[model samples]
Target: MSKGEELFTGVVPILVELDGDVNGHKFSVRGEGEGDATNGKLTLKFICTTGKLPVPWPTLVTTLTYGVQCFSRYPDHMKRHDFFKSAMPEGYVQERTISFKDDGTYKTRAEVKFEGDTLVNRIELKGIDFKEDGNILGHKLEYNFNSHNVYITADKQKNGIKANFKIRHNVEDGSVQLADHYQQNTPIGDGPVLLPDNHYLSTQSVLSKDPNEKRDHMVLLEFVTAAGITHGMDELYKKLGGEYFTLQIRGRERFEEFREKNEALELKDAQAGGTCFNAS
Candidate 1:
């Protein structure tokens, strides 16, 4: 019997599409990832296929892409206070090439990989500047894997604003449910809260446990602003020159833009040589 990682050697190609509006601007999101898991690399991209995505959306995308990449790292990036690091061995390699593109096709790519058993990350931003790249709102990203922390510091060339956000991997020990279910918690503060329309698209399934069940996917957006100045309201904020943003879009539908086997064929042909990734 083929034991260990060799048992799982096939390349898996995934394609998912989601459509929605961010602060009133329409977006057709295409997310694709292809990887040979046993070989240790996953190439992922988030593209705006319709190409109408605004500039401000990428700042949010920067946060989201980093979060997803961290999620992929799993127990390795998890804090020691939360979980012990027994499953991951030293010198084990994890590599990821993640990118996000705007409607104009300008791209921001993050190359994170392990070298000498240490994490090396570089950002390759194409045709964009500090404000345009929007990785940390004109700040440079400093990642400290040893401390399981990431820091965003103001760049001298850009705006001098400092901010930091930390992540806790193993939040709870409750039974994990992998299915789709909606859960709500009380709002964080007593501040103003606005709920968007709970309407569902015509293509959504109506089957549910209760007749009054709310199956709508909620996008909880919260931001702070000057007391009298509206900040995050999708309606009133726009009038005050405020634009809404999403940390991530969490739904997908199959798109018929290309033949699915196109990916399979590429994977199969590349596998003939015993590896599915190109050496850079």
Candidate 2:
């Protein structure tokens, strides 16, 4: 029973209502828990008693965050970025579910099976156990019946998360870097991958590539909203005191063309023992 305790201790129960119609086919998704310290396994199953399941499998997005009992309102409905799409694999296969557990590791969290038009999926709580120093970290999952995307968060601190912003910098080697600190203008190969449309230069923290000097740094920027567009282009400069920091937005292709045109000039300068090839 203690082995069961180890497996199911502090196991949290989950129940989600996934009610919707896909192309006129009616279905609902539900999850139930078994056992209780709660040492148990949670079953996330599909409900489609009336209509058939959709072809090419519809998605059931889920998000895991800190602090949130349940969703009185949902993201994408509340117009927030608190949830992410969790791709569901074909039932009765090993690809039924994926895990972002253990901080960010690819682990199998569940076994999903299809029973005619319904799904029977189970997840091990030990698999989703996020620990800091050998202690269980607690969070909550928020599911919207309409969107079918689950928003799991413990962040009751804010109403909800609005956007997922990312930042990156360019080094002298012509490579983009996730520069943590602007200590030097060197390229770092291993950095967090910046997802498309996830970086905001003005509204969020972005690191420079060099420290203790004022030099031109070429920034690769992406905007998620139209409001981000104006703020990045002009509004940000006024707020940050632009005499020390300035930003110029340009098209990606245009910058590449400009760089290509001057490539020969840069090569010539390098051969002539001149340092004219330095541009960040």
Candidate 3:
């Protein structure tokens, strides 16, 4: 259906790619419809699944802005971002014959393509409904993945809403971005130490409390490339345009140390607080 027709019909068949869940998945934003979104009238969402089926999980669904269908022509591949990015699709999960273990996961796939945009942005799943809301959501099986130990906690304010984003680059130890977040200055229980929050902790094991503060912490974004580290640190800063918060980038080697110090000092302050302390 055209992005235009959906307004009255209450249905927009969007093709979405599903991936990532610690095991194998990528939380994304997906959907395709026609409307004058600029006027702030195009408030869209899916009416599929329960309380909006997964509830438009936002941590991974980065606020999408229709800037332009831009992509780098690398002579081998063409890239572009659109209505359905990640899920809405930065790029649909192509060649994803993989998973946390399809081991009788009993997944089913369908061709729910967007009308005019005939590029086969397909949809697949095992748990949630097939044609659930176009804005699909997924959960990472574990927060601490591939890293020394995941501490990528990000307390955020999206459009003035309370959202703590914990983006961990839990991949192999081989190469490419290794990102996570942690904080200092304040003690673990002080303010809002949310390391063991539900749906954000590791599912593999029962997470224990860590009390040390790494002084020099690694905030929300920690992207390291061949050019040197410049992912969450400088990148998130620029992207948020000064409207950002604490996103420290610590050394992965100290990942173990930080957690240890915190755990060992569970009762007393990190001895590492702020370089000092605050709030009498």
Candidate lDDT scores, in order, read 0.27, 0.25, 0.24
User: What ranking emerges by TM-score with the best candidate at the front?
Assistant: 1, 2, 3
Which of the numbered candidates is closest to the native, going by highest TM-score? 1
Put the candidates in lDDT order, highest first.
1, 2, 3
Under the 3 Å rule for N, CA and C atoms, how many clashes does model 3 have? 32
After superposition, which runs of candidate 2 have C-alpha atoms over 4 Å from their true positions?
1-9, 34-43, 55-58, 61-158, 163-280
Clashes in each model (backbone N, CA, C under 3 Å)? 0, 15, 32
Task: Point out the higher-scoring one by lDDT: 1 or 2.
Answer: 1
Task: Report the C-alpha lDDT of model 2 over 24-113, residue by residue, as the tens digit.
Answer: 334443433221212111222334333443311112322111011111121121212112111111221121122222331112223333
- lDDT of the structure predicted as candidate 1: 0.27
Better of 1 and 3 by TM-score: 1
User: How do the residues 76-124 of candidate 1 rate in per-residue lDDT, one tens digit apiece?
Assistant: 1111111001111111111122222221222333333333332333333
lDDT of 3 by residue, 18-128 (tens): 332222332333433322222211222212222222322322212211111111010111001111111221222221111112111113233322345432334443333
Given candidate 3, what's the lDDT at residue 115? 40
